[PDB]
């Protein structure tokens, strides 16, 4: 079906969606090997055998082999992924008269629109469509939706496809119509990113189990029986079963537990058998259950027969199956701990993975379809989107909190904008073109938020270099031969007949960015990096969760290869600092001790030790076999504080009149954390261009001695040179 | 916008419950746009074709762009705000005998008497009104008492809407009357008290798709599905629930989280089914539980599966909504920390709503409320009968309280007047004009249980302003350093590697109310402004919540950009006065580092820590990105004493006996404390009340120094400085 580039063509998914969706991207070798010119429109002809045309646009990150088109315009004549295309460089005519009308069904006959004027005229603009189509048509501030969907009735050309031209006369019939093609609600994998790598990963789980027909969505493969997903309750996920059924073409069926559970004995369990057993005849079609924790909550706890049967009725209806009408089961929890161990068995449940959070990726994509959402759901050309900047700022939250978060950020548009009209009925062109959600009024917007949010720590690949914190290079030197033998060279393992050291201690006066060390090895190793410190021990374990933390190498050991980084362990001991409201150990580190036993380094996981000091830490808890390598970081030397200073501010202003020599020469008993600081600490007396009026020279970083210098840290050293000998 | 201008405006709400009943308020530039004068009797015209004539009064605070307007016609109307209105000059017909009754509703036809001649004649005085209308006269005593209401079968004159005037003949026949027009106990959005910014935040969301759905809903936002109020309950969450109601025309739907609990298996569950289903037909409309943390409190934890398949019913009967005939479930608790998360997202509530406690500002509303339906309003008697006095006394109060207050204030006016004459039967005209109230009822509740307990933790306002406070300009140029710059140039900051701050910290000599300063800037760069009281931490600590000392800080971090000023959250380690017994850390710093850190670029956000003793603090507080800047105050210069002391004496009596400059030569190492005592206490000694030109003198100023001695002292002052300079 797909070939790499010709009158065929691979169908693959744009990931910014294009900017409009005929903007379809191609590559330079895509066009030689069908004929064709980069940077015009293309007529395209696709398997059903339907119509259709594009405009190709500029390859980005693209790979040769693939051409990466939207689902919409895909779906529109309708195809998916895996399909084949004709395509040829052939313009036909150019639209001059067309006939529109929107679907009346989810309208219900309500709310007509200028759109005549307002927004097909100027959204115009050479936009590649089809005639005998539902064009998705741009406008209408953002209510949820996608775009604006008007019918294409009939265009002058007749039985070509054509994109109109700003010299045509176009007619919205304002009366009944509806879809050529597709449906009123629909919902393509792109439209529902909240990931790009793991949401193609969980589609692989369930589409080569679910592909099509003529491959295999029926054919043997034992493929799996039924899939639970995990992680991010309601936003995105809850939506991916609703997601995966528009894509693969099948019937879709809603199972919700408190439905279930609503209901009582008799009804109850045969509402579930009804809706299984209705699943034969609308075959093939996707069983989901939502809830499916709350059907099958026990583990220990029953308080009633008709949860037995519901869940044990379940049972009889999963292996009653054999996958004949090939109806496929999917499930979705926020928690694993709910599941029976007879749900985790073959015939029942079979692949099951958990799914994490967004990334700035993630909410990119997920911005991406805000202001797709919003007005300019179909774009008419393609602009650079300043929303870019947007993602990189984000942080903390999932899907659903930005989608309401946007609305947040319409209600502030708004509130300014059309309570001023007061909307009896018809709105004003003027008026709802004026009010832009565009990317100008985002900022505007974003300086209210009310979004909250609570979650765990997770993989992260730092910056950190050896010039971040320079200095103790011997460390350093040992800290590249401790990850990449294990690493790069496992097989100097076999010469050598040794067994590496299962991991190591880091300890030394605090402050000098032992978290930079843990991050810097991290950085250059490529491997993911999890640290595990104090505050979050305290955090989780408000809910008492010391089962929590032993997971965290769990989710560690699945995410490998990664560095596992143990800072400020046993957090209730330092947390009092000298005194204590316990003893010197509890219940708590028996979590961490029966863990570091368990998790093995043959893998790409790093153990990595540090704390403050280790003679609080309870000497049971630093005993060998587990951490073999005692090793210590001393404090900065002078030479380090001047290479360390001397990174730190080349990257922020500076003059010539400043000697970085003299300044590191007349501190000592002094930390690398402090050298961040006294880089700054000038700076609020004078930067380069401020405000306040002042300049950078000798004086400011003069006075950032005088602002910051030794607070008589050189207590921490001589307890380490007593530590080291008892 | 509530815009509409010129002869024909917009009917906007009254922001004053105002003492009237014609009284609608226009401004001077208002008044000039029909060319009437004040208090002038316009009839003025609305949607549904009904009129009315009103009286003009004026705040200097409107915009002539709208009306404010009494809630008699808005509800004799039925008008909900936002309607356009047309409003014309018209010269006075005025009525010559008037028949009045009131409706059947309110006095349920059990209700004669007498005073004719006290409620009407009083009431006699200049009415424009409608014929055909529900007049209303207030008075007397409170508690038991919203208006009363009289509806109009006939006016002498008929059909003409006439003025009341001191020539027409009264008359009060107390038979029946038509009921159409509804009683005032049905609320109106005058009584709320106060909480402006969120009545209307609240009210838009609500009101817009329970207007017009068909665009707010399709061409615009997205109608959530339910909303929770936070705050003390029982006060305000009741009536502010039937606030937004009544006003917006949508149907009351009532619910009671204990009648639910009460009940079990069918009934329980039949109501929540058998509301919804009366819902549909009444729908749009409100549906409201005040109970939400009694019936679905769950953390796990409780028991049964019948608790558990009601609430689970509650989550089916949500996502069963189609969103079309929308109708919008509201929830009221004290706290949203005691109930389910379970309720918190997709499908059911996203919504939450924070309703905090009135101030004595807050109080001037509540009061007012309570003061249209007595005749304490304006002063006619030997105090300040302007609410803000009563304010006073009353810190701390809710609208509950305060209506229990004047409502024990009714009791006291009670024993007074009932005893003494005791009438069983009889309602004679005279004890309604003998009963006035006066202030010795408050002063006696005031005196009563009215006080008992101290409830619960609050925050405050700021007022001051460079005007408000004197102080050291050092540090005040070095605060908006830290503060102005960074939130109103942000941008430039970023690009030109030049952070100046991320939060700053406070540390000097106590007792002079370093927090003055902070507000003084804060109230400048129109930033949020937060303190933290100490002993508010002091308490939680012990009791293992940092919890809620998070909740103001989040609350600050919402509705960022905002500068949030904490003063000794540390409180217990200042507490241990010059070291820290324990470890320098605590649990709460690590949630401000973590907070610190954890703070965005999406809203430009400076935290301020505050203490009496810096020494005391983590050492990664003082690090980038927590504490940037670290602020001393030195100790009052010899011309700061001298503006202080001038300040402070000039809010009471002063006369221009004195040299200002000598006092201040003989004072030196006096704070701020110490000089303002100095002036209070001259005056008391000084003469009481005397006709000479001399209040306060200077014997009493020299001589009152002698007495005294300079507050701080050179032990803590050496601490500060070592660690400036380190």
């Given at each position: 079906?797909?070939s790499?580039?010709?009158?065929?063509?691979?169908?693959?998914?744009?990931?910014?969606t294009?900017?409009?969706?005929?903007?379809?991207?191609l590559?330079?070798?895509?066009r030689?090997?069908?004929d064709?010119?980069?940077?015009?429109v293309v007529?395209?002809?696709?398997v059903?055998?339907?119509v259709?045309?594009?405009y190709?646009?500029?390859?980005?990150?693209?790979?040769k082999?693939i051409v990466?088109?939207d689902?919409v315009?895909?779906?529109?004549?309708?195809?998916?992924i895996?399909?084949?295309?004709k395509?040829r460089?052939?313009?036909?005519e150019?639209?001059?008269?067309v006939?529109?009308?929107?679907?009346?069904?989810?309208?219900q006959?309500?709310k007509?629109?200028?759109?005549?004027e307002?927004y097909?005229?100027?959204?115009?603009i050479?936009?590649?469509?089809?005639?005998?189509?539902?064009?998705?048509?741009?406008?209408?501030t953002?209510?949820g939706?996608?775009?604006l969907?008007?019918?294409?009735?009939?265009?002058?050309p007749?039985?070509?496809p054509?994109?109109?031209?700003?010299?045509?006369?176009?007619e919205?019939?304002?009366?009944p119509?509806?879809?050529?093609?597709?449906?009123?609600?629909?919902?393509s994998?792109?439209?529902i990113?909240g990931?790009?790598?793991?949401?193609?990963?969980?589609?692989?789980?369930?589409e080569?189990?679910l592909?099509?027909?003529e491959?295999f969505?029926?054919?043997?493969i034992?493929?799996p029986?039924?899939?639970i997903?995990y992680?991010?309750?309601?936003?995105?996920?809850?939506?991916?079963?609703?997601?995966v059924?528009?894509e693969?073409?099948?019937?879709?069926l809603?199972?919700?537990?408190?439905e279930?559970?609503?209901k009582?004995?008799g009804?109850?369990?045969?509402?579930?058998?009804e809706?299984?057993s209705?699943?034969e005849?609308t075959?093939?079609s996707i069983?989901?259950?939502?809830?499916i924790?709350?059907?099958?909550?026990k583990?220990?706890?029953?308080?009633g027969?008709?949860?037995?049967?519901?869940?044990?009725?379940?049972?009889?209806?999963?292996?009653?199956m054999?996958?004949?009408?090939?109806?496929?089961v999917?499930?979705?929890?926020?928690?694993?701990?709910?599941?029976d161990?007879?749900?985790?068995?073959?015939g029942?449940?079979?692949?099951?993975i958990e799914?994490?959070?967004?990334?700035?990726?993630?909410r990119?994509?997920?911005?991406?379809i805000?202001?797709?959402?919003?007005p300019?759901?179909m774009?008419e050309?393609?602009?650079?989107?300043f929303?870019?900047?947007?993602?990189?700022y984000?942080?903390?939250?999932?899907?659903?909190?930005?989608?309401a978060?946007?609305?947040?950020?319409?209600?502030?548009?708004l509130?300014?904008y059309?309570p001023?009209?007061?909307?009896?009925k018809?709105?004003?062109?003027?008026?709802?073109?004026?009010?832009?959600?565009?990317?100008?009024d985002?900022?505007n917007?974003?300086?209210?938020?009310?979004?909250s949010?609570?979650?765990?720590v997770?993989v992260?690949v730092?910056?950190?270099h050896?010039d971040?914190?320079?200095?103790?290079?011997?460390?350093?030197?040992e800290?590249?031969?401790?990850v990449?033998?294990?690493?790069?060279?496992?097989?100097?393992?076999?010469?050598?007949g040794?067994?590496?050291?299962?991991g190591?201690?880091?300890?030394?006066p605090?402050?000098?960015?032992?978290?930079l060390?843990?991050?810097?090895?991290?950085?250059?190793?490529?491997a993911?990096?999890?640290?595990?410190?104090?505050?979050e021990?305290?955090?989780?374990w408000?809910g008492?969760?010391?089962?929590?933390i032993?997971e965290?190498?769990?989710?560690?050991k699945?995410?490998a290869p990664?560095i596992?980084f143990?800072?400020?362990?046993?957090?209730?001991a330092?947390?009092?600092?000298?005194?204590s409201?316990?003893?010197?150990?509890?219940?708590?580190?028996?979590q961490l001790?029966?863990?570091?036993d368990?998790?093995?380094?043959?893998?790409?996981?790093?153990?990595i030790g540090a704390?403050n000091?280790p003679?609080?830490?309870?000497?049971?808890?630093?005993r060998?076999?587990?951490?073999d390598?005692?090793?210590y970081?001393?404090?900065?030397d002078?030479?380090?504080?001047?290479?360390?200073?001397?990174?730190?501010?080349?990257?922020?202003?500076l003059?010539?009149?400043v000697?970085?020599?003299?300044?590191?020469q007349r501190t000592?008993?002094?930390?690398?954390?402090?050298l961040?600081?006294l880089?700054?600490?000038?700076?609020?007396?004078?930067?380069?261009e401020?405000p306040?009026?002042?300049?950078?020279?000798?004086?400011?970083?003069?006075?950032?001695?005088?602002?910051?210098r030794?607070?008589?840290?050189?207590?921490?050293?001589?307890f380490?040179?007593?530590l080291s000998?008892?």
């Amino acid at each position: 079906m797909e070939s790499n580039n010709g009158i065929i063509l691979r169908v693959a998914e744009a990931n910014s969606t294009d900017p409009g969706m005929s903007r379809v991207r191609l590559d330079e070798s895509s066009r030689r090997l069908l004929d064709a010119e980069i940077g015009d429109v293309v007529e395209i002809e696709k398997v059903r055998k339907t119509v259709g045309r594009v405009y190709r646009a500029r390859p980005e990150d693209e790979n040769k082999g693939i051409v990466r088109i939207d689902s919409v315009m895909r779906n529109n004549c309708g195809a998916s992924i895996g399909d084949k295309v004709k395509v040829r460089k052939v313009r036909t005519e150019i639209a001059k008269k067309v006939t529109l009308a929107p679907i009346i069904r989810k309208d219900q006959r309500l709310k007509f629109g200028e759109g005549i004027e307002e927004y097909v005229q100027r959204a115009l603009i050479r936009r590649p469509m089809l005639e005998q189509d539902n064009i998705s048509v741009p406008g209408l501030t953002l209510a949820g939706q996608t775009g604006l969907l008007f019918k294409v009735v009939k265009t002058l050309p007749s039985k070509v496809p054509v994109e109109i031209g700003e010299e045509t006369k176009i007619e919205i019939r304002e009366e009944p119509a509806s879809e050529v093609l597709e449906e009123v609600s629909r919902i393509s994998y792109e439209d529902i990113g909240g990931l790009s790598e793991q949401l193609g990963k969980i589609r692989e789980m369930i589409e080569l189990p679910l592909k099509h027909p003529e491959l295999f969505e029926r054919l043997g493969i034992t493929p799996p029986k039924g899939v639970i997903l995990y992680g991010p309750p309601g936003t995105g996920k809850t939506l991916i079963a609703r997601a995966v059924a528009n894509e693969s073409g099948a019937n879709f069926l809603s199972i919700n537990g408190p439905e279930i559970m609503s209901k009582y004995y008799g009804q109850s369990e045969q509402k579930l058998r009804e809706i299984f057993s209705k699943a034969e005849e609308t075959a093939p079609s996707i069983i989901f259950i939502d809830e499916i924790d709350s059907i099958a909550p026990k583990r220990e706890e029953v308080q009633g027969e008709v949860e037995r049967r519901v869940v044990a009725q379940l049972l009889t209806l999963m292996d009653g199956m054999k996958e004949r009408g090939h109806v496929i089961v999917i499930g979705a929890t926020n928690r694993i701990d709910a599941i029976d161990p007879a749900l985790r068995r073959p015939g029942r449940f079979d692949r099951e993975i958990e799914i994490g959070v967004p990334d700035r990726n993630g909410r990119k994509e997920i911005l991406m379809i805000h202001t797709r959402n919003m007005p300019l759901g179909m774009s008419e050309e393609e602009k650079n989107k300043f929303l870019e900047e947007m993602a990189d700022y984000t942080y903390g939250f999932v899907g659903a909190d930005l989608a309401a978060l946007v609305r947040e950020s319409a209600m502030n548009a708004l509130r300014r904008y059309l309570p001023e009209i007061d909307l009896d009925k018809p709105i004003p062109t003027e008026i709802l073109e004026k009010m832009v959600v565009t990317e100008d009024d985002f900022k505007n917007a974003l300086k209210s938020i009310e979004p909250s949010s609570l979650r765990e720590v997770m993989v992260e690949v730092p910056n950190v270099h050896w010039d971040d914190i320079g200095g103790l290079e011997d460390v350093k030197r040992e800290i590249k031969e401790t990850v990449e033998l294990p690493l790069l060279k496992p097989d100097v393992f076999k010469r050598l007949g040794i067994r590496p050291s299962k991991g190591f201690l880091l300890y030394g006066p605090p402050g000098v960015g032992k978290t930079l060390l843990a991050k810097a090895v991290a950085t250059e190793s490529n491997a993911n990096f999890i640290s595990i410190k104090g505050p979050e021990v305290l955090s989780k374990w408000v809910g008492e969760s010391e089962k929590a933390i032993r997971e965290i190498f769990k989710k560690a050991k699945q995410v490998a290869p990664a560095i596992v980084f143990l800072d400020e362990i046993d957090s209730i001991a330092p947390r009092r600092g000298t005194t204590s409201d316990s003893g010197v150990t509890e219940r708590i580190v028996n979590q961490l001790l029966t863990s570091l036993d368990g998790i093995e380094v043959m893998n790409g996981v790093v153990v990595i030790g540090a704390t403050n000091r280790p003679d609080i830490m309870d000497p049971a808890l630093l005993r060998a076999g587990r951490f073999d390598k005692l090793i210590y970081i001393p404090p900065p030397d002078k030479e380090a504080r001047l290479s360390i200073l001397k990174v730190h501010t080349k990257n922020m202003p500076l003059a010539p009149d400043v000697d970085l020599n003299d300044i590191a020469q007349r501190t000592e008993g002094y930390v690398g954390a402090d050298l961040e600081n006294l880089c700054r600490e000038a700076g609020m007396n004078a930067y380069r261009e401020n405000p306040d009026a002042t300049s950078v020279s000798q004086k400011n970083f003069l006075d950032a001695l005088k602002t910051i210098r030794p607070s008589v840290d050189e207590e921490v050293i001589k307890f380490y040179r007593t530590l080291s000998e008892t």
